[PDB]
Design a protein around this ligand. Structure first.
Ligand SMILES: C[n+]1cn([C@@H]2O[C@H](COP(=O)(O)OP(=O)(O)OP(=O)(O)OC[C@H]3O[C@@H](n4cnc5c(=O)[nH]c(N)nc54)[C@H](O)[C@@H]3O)[C@@H](O)[C@H]2O)c2nc(N)[nH]c(=O)c21
Lengths: 732, 137, 148, 74
């Protein structure tokens, strides 16, 4: 019971009360002291937890650890003892993001008279000292600075009352360090390359610039609520403590540090003239506001309805254009370089839940942001655009596809390849897949018809062709007859024995015919593949066969991208074709004309994931089997791991070799015909290569020797190398 | 309490903000413990917010009540048009006392809504008996 | 660690596998380990293609089984979606449940598991039981309830 | 969804719903295994109540057959 009640109450304070917060902190303060005799360990646990899991409540709980320290010095000393232990653990386990919340909780305690202001400074001095450390990844040297700077919004003001001498010498080594960092990763992490309006800044530079405006403002920010900073009635006479000498954990080969980031920015106060002035991009208020909002989503991501509510009720010290901050932060997450913190579909419905909660004001802002995103499309990164298309099209389908399409009339007279028209075409294509062809033709104006998607009709070769000069024609006609008759494999094989030339012609007449007679539904085509599965495994026993199947299937369904995708997927899972073949198919000349369409990549990534999932699965089995006949298996599971990983490496190897080949071909041709290198085709192609790295950087890391010395070498065009070097900078 | 009367209301003021505004005031220092300063701060807000509510919604009932009293002076029925009445009452302090035009019109619309009634009740009872007899048949 | 674990959208519903064999205990053990979902309120004309496109947003789908009129053998207004992993089914439960599929608000529920015969409406008239007593008009489910 | 155990031999889910309704309102019922069954209520209030009040009660079938049924939250 009691155990239960404590955790309940510890949370109540953070939650929205119905009696001034200060009161609750007053009460809970004593209550907790009264229970210290019997429940010291639990309360000591509960607080260390809310400290690393409820950052958005940082100051409500620091206060609490204060009122307590103001009634039991020895208690505070124990809490601060745990915190350091808890912090050393998070660090050793590579859970750096959790650490920051700890390191930041300590910081604010200094404002609660619990930790010696001078004490904090000594630790930070050691954090920055990491910048000197020799032969360590920059992402490591980066995290300590970030942990330091991100704290100042809380500690800085009072941490400036003391040790300004070293609290100047620290900024000194920082400034020095900040100007010596390589920024190779920025181009690969920016949502937009255009900085004409608002620049997408490297996260440390942006924060550095933020501290400055604060420092030069005498460290006086006006947002961070402070519920335990008032030590003029109690906290004053409290006896602070001293954090033991903190020696940052030595960089090991098992260390993994957060990747660098780029600050997503799309709004400024002029985007909301008639609304409370929006904190500027370089104001700490902006940082803190987005930080809490990001943390709120991190705490409630699993429950969308609770989530919207915690966002909308966010407590701001001084009024701010909340709705705008909520939308900006959600897009900041959806478009997070390659992909955000949580599953993509979560942001879609989260936004819906917010529109249902603030019916009168959220929708307009969301409609304003959509407009702005569309207008800035020209320099948005391909990976984000895809995300934009899927979000918007899925969003539309929940609001009867109602949108003011004429607002985007400008796309109508642009090269079909330009980002705007292409974006519209893709969005519409997506809307069709969530409903049907005719429905979409009906929602857009007559002027847009040209951008609507083609009717997804099957294309039989030997069909009502009547153009019979084609090879295997009659053979196909027998097949059609057999299939409609509940023919068997051997029978079909027989029909096929009468085919003149791995036999390309046999494949084509089989596929063209089998698919045509199952073109009514996905479920028909599937069973079709399952029934005559044996035939497939025969005709396509070779890679040429595998490749030819994909080629004929594409010939048949080129007007129905969703069909093509589900078929390839089904074929891979039933081993009618393998990922290598799918990869070669993607870069094949037969797809050259559709190379930049979304479905092509949606398929390639879905193939890569199946490969990855597969590898992971077998690895686990071995893992479990190794944790125990039982041997003959581990012998076998080992072999399977080998093959799986080998085929995985080969998939990345081929994909990269193909990218290098087509990009070089383009670069050379251009550098010969003195033509522009920056074509729409190039943009998609170079950014698609970048995406391979973004989506699977973890797996790709395992191939550094091969990648760094065998593929992406110096003889390669710098435009291609650039992509590789950007990737390496992610964990450099 | 005096410390809070020197600032600008701020009913949703944080305790550390309130403590910053009144920290050098002697009525603030007069209370020994920080906890009791916060408790007085919390209660006075909660009693001021409780009173603003109860006050601004007896003024609401008083604005509305006055507006009706103004209208009661003119011979209004379901016919009468607000386009016409407006130009007759627009000078009154009870008309201006409603800070909006959309709402003076709604209040007006609300305000706007024996033998013949006996015959109507006759028709109603006849229809009821007819429905009952039709159901029985 | 603490109550942040809240996952109300993934919790078991009140519905029980109708013709299921085991205890309520055996049905519940299957439901908490399932990868297959029950999808309700579809229109009679909602296709497998649409279902695939919306439900794939939460993970890869293994199979989709359309609910049918036991006697007419036509789309009934419900279906079963089966994922390869429960994590993906949970996300559908979390972010797809309660949203629009083919212009109508749908509801998902955990399902013990598909078995031959689960695809047929148990509705007295052939369709879903739900439609026998519906007193509302629904042009996606054939107008008024069967008892009308 | 709750489960039922200890139902009569000559009984169906349709007749059971008439007994479960006492809790408030039922959404679906079933009787499989030739002994145990199941029921689906609307709200948790009426549901939790059924397992509380409508527990180990005496079911009465339309065939003049009575028995003891056990309700449980599933
Ligand atoms: C609704 N539902 C169906 N299936 C599956 O889909 C198939 C179609 O059969 P139905 O023909 O759809 O089947 P039942 O639900 O068996 O029977 P029933 O539970 O009695 O219940 C409720 C629906 O009918 C209504 N109803 C039932 N009896 C009455 C009654 O006497 N009066 C009134 N007014 N309404 C009633 C009620 O409103 C209710 O919501 C079957 O294979 C099922 O397994 C579900 N599977 C899961 N996991 N979750 C669900 O929520 C679910």
């Amino acid at each position: 019971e009691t155990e239960d009640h404590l955790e309940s109450l510890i949370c109540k304070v953070g939650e929205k009360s119905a009696c001034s917060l200060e009161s609750n902190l007053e009460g809970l303060a004593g209550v907790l002291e009264a229970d210290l005799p019997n429940y010291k360990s639990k309360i000591l646990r509960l607080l260390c937890t809310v400290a690393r899991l409820l950052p958005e409540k940082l100051t409500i709980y620091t206060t609490l650890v204060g009122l307590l320290n103001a009634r039991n010095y020895n208690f505070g000393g124990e809490f601060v003892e745990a915190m350091i232990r808890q912090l050393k653990e998070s660090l050793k386990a590579n859970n750096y993001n959790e650490a920051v919340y700890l390191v930041r909780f300590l910081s604010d305690l200094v404002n609660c008279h619990v930790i010696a202001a001078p004490s904090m400074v000594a630790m930070f001095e050691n954090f920055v000292s990491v910048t000197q450390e020799e032969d360590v990844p920059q992402v490591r040297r980066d995290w300590y600075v970030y942990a330091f700077l991100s704290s100042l919004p809380w500690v800085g003001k009072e941490l400036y009352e003391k040790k300004d001498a070293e609290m100047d010498r620290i900024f000194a080594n920082t400034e020095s360090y900040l100007k010596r960092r390589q920024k190779t990763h920025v181009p690969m992490l920016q949502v937009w390359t255009a900085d004409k309006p608002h620049p997408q800044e490297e996260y440390l530079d942006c924060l550095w610039a933020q501290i400055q405006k604060l420092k030069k403002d005498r460290w006086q920010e006006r947002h961070i609520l402070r519920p335990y900073l008032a030590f003029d009635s109690i906290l004053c006479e409290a006896l602070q403590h001293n954090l033991p000498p903190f020696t940052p954990p030595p960089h090991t080969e098992d260390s993994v540090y957060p990747m660098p980031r780029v600050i997503f920015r799309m709004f400024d106060y002029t985007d909301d003239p008639e609304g409370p002035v929006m904190p500027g991009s370089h104001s700490v208020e902006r940082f803190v506001i987005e930080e809490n909002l990001h943390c709120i989503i991190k705490s409630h991501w699993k429950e969308r309805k609770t989530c919207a509510a915690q966002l909308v009720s966010y407590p701001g010290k001084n009024k701010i254009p909340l709705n705008y901050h909520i939308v900006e932060v959600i897009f900041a997450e959806l478009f997070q370089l390659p992909a955000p913190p949580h599953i993509d579909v979560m942001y879609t419905t989260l936004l819906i839940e917010l529109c249902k909660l603030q019916p009168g004001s959220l929708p307009q802002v969301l409609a304003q942001a959509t407009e702005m995103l569309y207008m800035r499309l020209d320099t948005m990164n391909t990976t984000c655009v895809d995300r934009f298309i899927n979000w918007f099209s899925h969003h539309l389908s929940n609001f009867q596809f109602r949108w003011s399409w004429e607002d985007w009339s400008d796309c109508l007279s642009q090269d079909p390849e330009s980002p705007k028209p292409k974006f519209v075409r893709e969005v519409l294509e997506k809307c069709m897949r969530l409903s049907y062809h005719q429905r979409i033709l009906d929602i857009v104006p007559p002027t847009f018809s040209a951008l609507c998607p083609a009717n997804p009709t099957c294309i039989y070769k030997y069909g009502d062709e009547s153009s019979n000069s084609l090879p295997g024609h009659s053979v196909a006609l027998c097949l059609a007859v057999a299939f409609k008759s509940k023919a068997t494999n051997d029978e079909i094989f027989s029909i096929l024995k009468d085919v003149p030339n791995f036999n390309p012609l046999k494949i084509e007449v089989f596929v063209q015919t089998l698919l045509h007679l199952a073109a009514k539904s996905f479920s028909h085509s599937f069973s079709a593949l399952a029934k005559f599965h044996e035939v497939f495994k025969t005709l396509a026993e070779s890679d040429e066969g595998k490749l030819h199947v994909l080629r004929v299937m594409f010939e048949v369904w080129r007007n129905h991208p969703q069909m093509i995708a589900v078929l390839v997927d089904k074929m891979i899972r039933t081993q009618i074709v393998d990922c290598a073949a799918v990869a070669n198919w993607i870069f094949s000349s037969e797809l050259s004309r559709d190379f930049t369409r979304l479905f092509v990549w949606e398929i390639l990534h879905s193939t890569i994931r199946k490969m990855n999932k597969h590898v992971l699965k077998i690895q686990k089995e071995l893992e479990e089997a190794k944790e125990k006949v039982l041997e003959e298996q581990i012998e076998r599971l080992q072999e399977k791991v080998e093959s799986a990983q080998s085929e995985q490496k080969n998939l990345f190897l081929v994909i990269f070799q193909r990218f290098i080949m087509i990009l070089t071909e383009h670069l050379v041709r251009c550098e010969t015909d003195g033509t522009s290198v920056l074509t729409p085709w190039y943009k998609n192609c170079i950014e698609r290569l970048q995406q391979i790295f973004l989506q699977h950087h973890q797996i790709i890391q395992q191939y550094m020797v091969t990648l760094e010395n065998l593929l992406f070498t110096a003889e390669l065009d710098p435009h291609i190398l650039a992509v590789f070097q950007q990737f390496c900078a992610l964990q450099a | 309490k005096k410390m809070m009367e020197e600032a600008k209301f701020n009913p949703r003021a944080t305790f550390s903000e309130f403590a910053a505004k009144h920290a050098k005031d002697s009525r603030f220092k007069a209370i020994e413990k920080m906890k009791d300063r916060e408790a007085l701060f919390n209660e006075f807000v909660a009693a001021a917010r409780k009173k603003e509510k109860e006050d601004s919604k007896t003024r609401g009932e008083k604005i509305k009540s006055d507006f009706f009293e103004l209208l009661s002076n003119h011979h209004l029925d379901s016919q009468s048009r607000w386009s016409k009445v407006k130009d007759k009452v627009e000078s009154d302090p009870r008309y201006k006392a409603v800070d909006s035009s959309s709402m003076r019109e709604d209040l007006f619309k609300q305000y706007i809504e024996e033998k013949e009634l006996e015959r109507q009740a006759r028709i109603e009872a006849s229809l009821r008996e007819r429905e009952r007899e039709v159901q029985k048949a | 660690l603490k109550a942040l674990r809240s996952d109300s959208y993934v919790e078991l519903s009140q519905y029980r596998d109708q013709h299921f064999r085991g205890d309520n205990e055996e049905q519940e053990k299957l439901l908490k380990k399932s990868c297959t979902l029950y999808v309700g309120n579809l229109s009679f004309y909602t296709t497998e293609e649409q279902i695939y496109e919306l439900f794939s947003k939460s993970g890869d789908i293994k199979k989709i089984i359309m609910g049918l009129d036991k006697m007419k053998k036509t789309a009934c207004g419900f279906c079963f979606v089966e994922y390869y992993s429960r994590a993906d089914a949970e996300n559908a439960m979390r972010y797809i449940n309660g949203t629009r599929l083919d212009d109508r608000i749908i509801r998902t529920d955990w399902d013990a598991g598909f078995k031959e015969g689960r695809q047929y409406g148990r509705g007295r008239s052939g369709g879903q039981v739900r439609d026998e007593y519906r007193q509302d008009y629904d042009a996606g489910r054939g107008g008024y309830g069967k008892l009308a | 969804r709750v489960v039922v155990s200890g139902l009569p031999p000559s009984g169906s889910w349709q007749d059971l719903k008439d007994h479960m309704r006492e809790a408030g309102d039922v959404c679906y019922a079933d009787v499989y295994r030739d002994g145990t069954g199941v029921v689906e209520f609307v709200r948790k209030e009426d549901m939790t109540y059924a397992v509380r009040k409508l527990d180990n009660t005496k079911f009465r079938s339309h065939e003049g057959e009575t028995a003891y049924i056990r309700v449980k939250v599933d």
